Amino acid sequence: EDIDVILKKSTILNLDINNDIISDISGFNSSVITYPDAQLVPGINGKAIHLVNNESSEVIVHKAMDIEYNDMFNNFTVSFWLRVPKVSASHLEQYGTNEYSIISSMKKHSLSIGSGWSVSLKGNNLIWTLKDSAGEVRQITFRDLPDKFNAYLANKWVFITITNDRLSSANLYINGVLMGSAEITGLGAIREDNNITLKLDRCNNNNQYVSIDKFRIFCKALNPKEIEKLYTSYLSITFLRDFWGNPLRYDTEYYLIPVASSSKDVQLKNITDYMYLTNAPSYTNGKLNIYYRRLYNGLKFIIKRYTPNNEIDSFVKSGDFIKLYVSYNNNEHIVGYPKDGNAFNNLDRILRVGYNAPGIPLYKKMEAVKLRDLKTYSVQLKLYDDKNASLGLVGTHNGQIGNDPNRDILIASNWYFNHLKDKILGCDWYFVPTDEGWTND
């Protein structure tokens, strides 16, 4: 009765991508069929399934003869990481009322009726549906947050967990927290289809695509304690992740956004000079009750490896030594701190972009690490000097420089190693890459 044990024994279906082949590692050996257009993209711990809106993008799981988990009153839980692009205002108008299924165990235009369960979306609403053998149905309807920067169906990898207890209710969990319930008592036996099909069915927006990962099924209704453990077991601090939950790539551009003040953008005063925070502009839409801070404005950064070692991996791993640069005016400028450059209180060292000065050593050795907030897709950058001593973590500091107005200048500081168990710190950075899953309206 160790949670890890329970989670192991209760698993009767578990899909994992290995060798670019989709398979069931549950032990039960369910037949997994993959159609030509079911594509693989990077995901939470390896690769995920990416389904586009076409008949050829489909994955079919044919359950083992023994894998009977929804008999007369048999409790069950279904989990998976989901990632759906941000719906544009226009599509929210044309397709806001369009409910399309993405995962379902219901045989539709046939001899039977809605077999058993389905997961679908209608606008910015995730839906869980249960249908018994007599055609009775219960549903959970989860309405997403208005602030798309902090929403769940707005382009980030989020862990979905739908538990079902026949004596009480079906609960919807997102990232380990309960967001919706529905009393399912009074529902009869569930007479399902032998196949569990992952596919965009009934979607009228040809550009709708979705990614699903770690589709798993349990023969019991997990409780909070078990969902939390399961949820975090996927958060392995191996590779660092970008703002969407995907792996951090080296020679790729990124926009920085301090998690402590997610409304600010990073700006360059002038080439050989410092960087400071600015206010990101906002999109708002009263009619659709949607709004969010615009992304993609501000300096662009690039992570380069410090030295060529053993193997050239494309993903930045927690602990790798790197060099941060900023693409600007068609050149790439190294970020570092000059031997005796400007600094507040003898400690908070001011960071320079492309600082070029004959005879003055520049400190650039950075270390990308995940020191805190494992549930957040953030990064902490550490700067070192020629002797590999720490100049500190990269964060901000408020003050002036010259006749320049008061600003929150990016600095490097060791102070952060004193205040570190806090929920909000300031040395935490989101790495945001341009993604077609997110367009500003």
PDB file of all heavy atoms in Angstrom, residues 45 87 164 230 236 242 264 279 294 327 363 375 395:
ATOM      1  N   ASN A  45       8.150  13.757 -21.342  1.00  0.00           N
ATOM      2  CA  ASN A  45       9.304  12.935 -20.997  1.00  0.00           C
ATOM      3  C   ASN A  45       9.568  12.077 -22.230  1.00  0.00           C
ATOM      4  O   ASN A  45       9.306  10.877 -22.247  1.00  0.00           O
ATOM      5  CB  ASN A  45       8.994  12.072 -19.756  1.00  0.00           C
ATOM      6  CG  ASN A  45      10.246  11.466 -19.111  1.00  0.00           C
ATOM      7  OD1 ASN A  45      11.373  11.672 -19.562  1.00  0.00           O
ATOM      8  ND2 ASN A  45      10.039  10.721 -18.030  1.00  0.00           N
ATOM      9  N   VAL A  87      -7.085  29.169 -28.731  1.00  0.00           N
ATOM     10  CA  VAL A  87      -8.085  29.480 -29.741  1.00  0.00           C
ATOM     11  C   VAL A  87      -8.101  30.986 -29.945  1.00  0.00           C
ATOM     12  O   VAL A  87      -8.075  31.763 -28.977  1.00  0.00           O
ATOM     13  CB  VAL A  87      -9.523  28.967 -29.366  1.00  0.00           C
ATOM     14  CG1 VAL A  87     -10.537  29.399 -30.443  1.00  0.00           C
ATOM     15  CG2 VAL A  87      -9.550  27.425 -29.238  1.00  0.00           C
ATOM     16  N   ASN A 164     -13.397   8.248 -11.564  1.00  0.00           N
ATOM     17  CA  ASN A 164     -14.826   7.918 -11.570  1.00  0.00           C
ATOM     18  C   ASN A 164     -15.206   6.910 -10.500  1.00  0.00           C
ATOM     19  O   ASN A 164     -14.745   5.770 -10.554  1.00  0.00           O
ATOM     20  CB  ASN A 164     -15.204   7.317 -12.918  1.00  0.00           C
ATOM     21  CG  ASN A 164     -14.837   8.216 -14.097  1.00  0.00           C
ATOM     22  OD1 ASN A 164     -15.702   8.910 -14.648  1.00  0.00           O
ATOM     23  ND2 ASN A 164     -13.586   8.150 -14.538  1.00  0.00           N
ATOM     24  N   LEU A 230       1.429  10.816  -8.825  1.00  0.00           N
ATOM     25  CA  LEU A 230       1.461  10.457 -10.246  1.00  0.00           C
ATOM     26  C   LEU A 230       1.844  11.675 -11.083  1.00  0.00           C
ATOM     27  O   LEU A 230       2.699  11.602 -11.970  1.00  0.00           O
ATOM     28  CB  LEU A 230       0.081   9.923 -10.673  1.00  0.00           C
ATOM     29  CG  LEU A 230      -0.247   9.592 -12.127  1.00  0.00           C
ATOM     30  CD1 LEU A 230       0.553   8.382 -12.619  1.00  0.00           C
ATOM     31  CD2 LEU A 230      -1.735   9.344 -12.230  1.00  0.00           C
ATOM     32  N   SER A 236      10.503  15.168 -14.309  1.00  0.00           N
ATOM     33  CA  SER A 236      11.883  14.739 -14.059  1.00  0.00           C
ATOM     34  C   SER A 236      12.851  15.856 -14.380  1.00  0.00           C
ATOM     35  O   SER A 236      12.864  16.338 -15.516  1.00  0.00           O
ATOM     36  CB  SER A 236      12.239  13.548 -14.955  1.00  0.00           C
ATOM     37  OG  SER A 236      12.350  13.948 -16.320  1.00  0.00           O
ATOM     38  N   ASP A 242      10.762  24.782 -21.660  1.00  0.00           N
ATOM     39  CA  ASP A 242      10.421  26.132 -21.996  1.00  0.00           C
ATOM     40  C   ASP A 242       9.034  26.437 -21.416  1.00  0.00           C
ATOM     41  O   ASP A 242       8.405  25.587 -20.765  1.00  0.00           O
ATOM     42  CB  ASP A 242      10.519  26.387 -23.520  1.00  0.00           C
ATOM     43  CG  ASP A 242       9.560  25.532 -24.365  1.00  0.00           C
ATOM     44  OD1 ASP A 242       8.463  25.173 -23.913  1.00  0.00           O
ATOM     45  OD2 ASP A 242       9.896  25.257 -25.536  1.00  0.00           O
ATOM     46  N   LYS A 264       6.049  41.790 -17.542  1.00  0.00           N
ATOM     47  CA  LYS A 264       7.182  42.555 -18.020  1.00  0.00           C
ATOM     48  C   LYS A 264       7.948  41.805 -19.109  1.00  0.00           C
ATOM     49  O   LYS A 264       7.959  40.568 -19.147  1.00  0.00           O
ATOM     50  CB  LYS A 264       8.130  42.867 -16.857  1.00  0.00           C
ATOM     51  CG  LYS A 264       7.482  43.462 -15.606  1.00  0.00           C
ATOM     52  CD  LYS A 264       7.063  44.895 -15.807  1.00  0.00           C
ATOM     53  CE  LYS A 264       7.007  45.627 -14.485  1.00  0.00           C
ATOM     54  NZ  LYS A 264       7.303  47.087 -14.682  1.00  0.00           N
ATOM     55  N   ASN A 279       6.913  47.157 -19.793  1.00  0.00           N
ATOM     56  CA  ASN A 279       5.575  46.631 -19.628  1.00  0.00           C
ATOM     57  C   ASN A 279       5.058  46.021 -20.912  1.00  0.00           C
ATOM     58  O   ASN A 279       5.111  46.648 -21.970  1.00  0.00           O
ATOM     59  CB  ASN A 279       4.638  47.722 -19.127  1.00  0.00           C
ATOM     60  CG  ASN A 279       4.717  47.896 -17.629  1.00  0.00           C
ATOM     61  OD1 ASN A 279       5.457  48.744 -17.123  1.00  0.00           O
ATOM     62  ND2 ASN A 279       3.987  47.056 -16.903  1.00  0.00           N
ATOM     63  N   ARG A 294       0.318  40.146 -24.187  1.00  0.00           N
ATOM     64  CA  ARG A 294       0.884  39.756 -25.462  1.00  0.00           C
ATOM     65  C   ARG A 294       2.284  39.187 -25.304  1.00  0.00           C
ATOM     66  O   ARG A 294       3.089  39.662 -24.499  1.00  0.00           O
ATOM     67  CB  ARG A 294       0.933  40.948 -26.403  1.00  0.00           C
ATOM     68  CG  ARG A 294      -0.421  41.388 -26.840  1.00  0.00           C
ATOM     69  CD  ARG A 294      -0.377  42.493 -27.842  1.00  0.00           C
ATOM     70  NE  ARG A 294      -1.748  42.919 -28.047  1.00  0.00           N
ATOM     71  CZ  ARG A 294      -2.523  42.498 -29.042  1.00  0.00           C
ATOM     72  NH1 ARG A 294      -2.053  41.643 -29.954  1.00  0.00           N
ATOM     73  NH2 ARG A 294      -3.806  42.854 -29.066  1.00  0.00           N
ATOM     74  N   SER A 327      19.951  38.148 -29.880  1.00  0.00           N
ATOM     75  CA  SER A 327      19.899  38.487 -31.299  1.00  0.00           C
ATOM     76  C   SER A 327      19.398  39.911 -31.315  1.00  0.00           C
ATOM     77  O   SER A 327      18.366  40.216 -30.694  1.00  0.00           O
ATOM     78  CB  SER A 327      18.919  37.591 -32.084  1.00  0.00           C
ATOM     79  OG  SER A 327      19.279  36.214 -32.070  1.00  0.00           O
ATOM     80  N   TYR A 363      32.789  38.065 -18.001  1.00  0.00           N
ATOM     81  CA  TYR A 363      32.372  36.806 -17.390  1.00  0.00           C
ATOM     82  C   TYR A 363      31.077  36.334 -18.057  1.00  0.00           C
ATOM     83  O   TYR A 363      30.067  37.030 -18.028  1.00  0.00           O
ATOM     84  CB  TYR A 363      32.248  37.013 -15.881  1.00  0.00           C
ATOM     85  CG  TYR A 363      33.543  37.531 -15.284  1.00  0.00           C
ATOM     86  CD1 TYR A 363      33.547  38.461 -14.252  1.00  0.00           C
ATOM     87  CD2 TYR A 363      34.771  37.024 -15.714  1.00  0.00           C
ATOM     88  CE1 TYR A 363      34.739  38.848 -13.650  1.00  0.00           C
ATOM     89  CE2 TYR A 363      35.957  37.411 -15.125  1.00  0.00           C
ATOM     90  CZ  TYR A 363      35.935  38.315 -14.094  1.00  0.00           C
ATOM     91  OH  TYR A 363      37.128  38.637 -13.482  1.00  0.00           O
ATOM     92  N   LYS A 375       7.000  22.362 -10.685  1.00  0.00           N
ATOM     93  CA  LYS A 375       5.732  22.333 -11.417  1.00  0.00           C
ATOM     94  C   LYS A 375       5.643  23.485 -12.411  1.00  0.00           C
ATOM     95  O   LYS A 375       4.701  23.558 -13.196  1.00  0.00           O
ATOM     96  CB  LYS A 375       4.552  22.392 -10.436  1.00  0.00           C
ATOM     97  CG  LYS A 375       4.496  21.250  -9.421  1.00  0.00           C
ATOM     98  CD  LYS A 375       3.370  21.419  -8.411  1.00  0.00           C
ATOM     99  CE  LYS A 375       3.262  20.198  -7.490  1.00  0.00           C
ATOM    100  NZ  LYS A 375       2.082  20.297  -6.580  1.00  0.00           N
ATOM    101  N   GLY A 395      18.784  37.803 -12.103  1.00  0.00           N
ATOM    102  CA  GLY A 395      17.473  38.256 -11.646  1.00  0.00           C
ATOM    103  C   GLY A 395      17.411  39.746 -11.917  1.00  0.00           C
ATOM    104  O   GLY A 395      17.965  40.188 -12.916  1.00  0.00           O
TER     105      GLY A 395
END
